[PDB]
Ligand binder design. Structure first.
Ligand code: FES
Lengths: 56, 116
C-alpha cells in the first residue's frame, strides 16, 4: 500500500503483527482478466471402438 | 386347444399358431422397438429395429415378421439384441439431418425417443 513508514510502524505496533506481509487489499499479484484459450480434454468414453453403450 | 407354449425371458405364455415374436412380446407385456411395423399395415421388415435374439440360435431374428414356434425362449434384454438395436440406430442416425430444433416432430419423434 501507499503508506508512510511512521504510520506503518504505528499500525504494526498497535496490531502486533506485520500488516504489509499479508495485506487484505488485492494488488497486481492477481491473475489477468484476459486469458489464453483453454482445451478442456474429453472424457473417458470418447473412444471410436469398443464403446458400446450397453456396457457403460 | 391349438395354442402353443412360447417363453419370453423364461416366462411361459400361450400363443395361437401364426403369432409373431413381436406379438408374443406384447402379450407378455413388453414393446419391441419398431420403425416400419404397423399393426394396421402389411409387414415389411425394412428397419430391422425389431431384431431380437432367440435362445440357442446364432442369428438374430426380426420379431415383427418371424412367426414363433413351440419351445422358443425370446431373450429381449440380452446383450446381442441390445447391440443389434444400437447398431441399427447408429445406421439410422448416420445420415439423419440435425433438424431437431426446426422439426415439427420435436417432442413426439419415435426416432428421438427410441434413440434415447
Ligand atoms: S419393425 Fe422393422 S424390421 Fe420389424
Amino acid at each position: 500500500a501507499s503508506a508512510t513508514r511512521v504510520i506503518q510502524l504505528l499500525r504494526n505496533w498497535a496490531s502486533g503483527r506485520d500488516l504489509q506481509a499479508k495485506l487484505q487489499l488485492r494488488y497486481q499479484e492477481i491473475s489477468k482478466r484476459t486469458q489464453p484459450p483453454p482445451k478442456l480434454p474429453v472424457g473417458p468414453s470418447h473412444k471410436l471402438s469398443n464403446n458400446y453403450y450397453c456396457t457403460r | 386347444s391349438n395354442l402353443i407354449e412360447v417363453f419370453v425371458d423364461g416366462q411361459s405364455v400361450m400363443v395361437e399358431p401364426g403369432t409373431t415374436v413381436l406379438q408374443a412380446c406384447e402379450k407378455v407385456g413388453m414393446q419391441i422397438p419398431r420403425f416400419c411395423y404397423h399393426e394396421r399395415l402389411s409387414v415389411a421388415g425394412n428397419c430391422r429395429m425389431c431384431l431380437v435374439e432367440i435362445e440357442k440360435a446364432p442369428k438374430v431374428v426380426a420379431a415383427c415378421a418371424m412367426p414363433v414356434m413351440k419351445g422358443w425362449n425370446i431373450l429381449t434384454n440380452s446383450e446381442k439384441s441390445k447391440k443389434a438395436r444400437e447398431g441399427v440406430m447408429e445406421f439410422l442416425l448416420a445420415n439423419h439431418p440435425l433438424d431437431c430444433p426446426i422439426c415439427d416432430q420435436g417432442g413426439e419423434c419415435d426416432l428421438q425417443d427410441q434413440s434415447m
